[PDB]
Structure 1
């Protein structure tokens, strides 16, 4: 894979919302309220071994705490899945 910094525009915010919504269905943290994806946002390109998919790592502020969310995206299907949601974590 290769990692790159991505900006925190609407698409990235919408990934953050996705992570919180998914976590709220999962229920590990009870009910979270999405606030914002903060910098830095990172995106890993995963080759088939030719792009297979991507992994986003986002710092997501929800319920006034910070969480680290890792989201996978399948290049062909366009489907996304919440892989990890850790925290609360300290600020990057």
Structure 2
């Protein structure tokens, strides 16, 4: 399964909040305040045709800094895990 562009509406925004909420448990940057997920947002669907889960890559502004966050999502349960959180990075 491949990567595709997705929009930055409510579902993506809540992915962003998840990422920042998970990074705040780790503490690597000190306490971040979620601002917004910006374009572009990418999803990889991991797989007759049957979806197992997804991988999201997002650019998340928090505390007015840009970070790159990768999130895995389970298709059946919608359990969610923060795989990576990099930055600050410049915009794509």
Compute the TM-score of the two structures, normalised by the length of structure 1: 0.95
Between the two proteins, the alignment pairs up a number of residues equal to 92
Cα drift, residue 47 of structure 1:
1.3
Q: Which runs of 5+ in 1 are unaligned?
A: none
Alignment match, 1:71 = 71
Q: Deviations over 1:13-71 (max 9, x none)?
A: 01100100000011111100111000000000011992110000000001111000000
Once residues 69 and 17 of structure 2 are traced to their aligned partners in structure 1, the CA distance between those partners, rounded to angstroms, is 11
Q: Deviations over 1:57-91 (max 9, x none)?
A: 00000111100000000111110000000010011
Q: Which runs of 5+ in 2 are unaligned?
A: none
Compute the TM-score of the two structures, normalised by the length of structure 2: 0.95
Which ranges of 4 or more aligned residues in structure 1 deviate by more than 4 Å? none
Q: CA RMSD in A?
A: 1.6
Once residues 48 and 65 of structure 1 are traced to their aligned partners in structure 2, the CA distance between those partners, rounded to angstroms, is 43
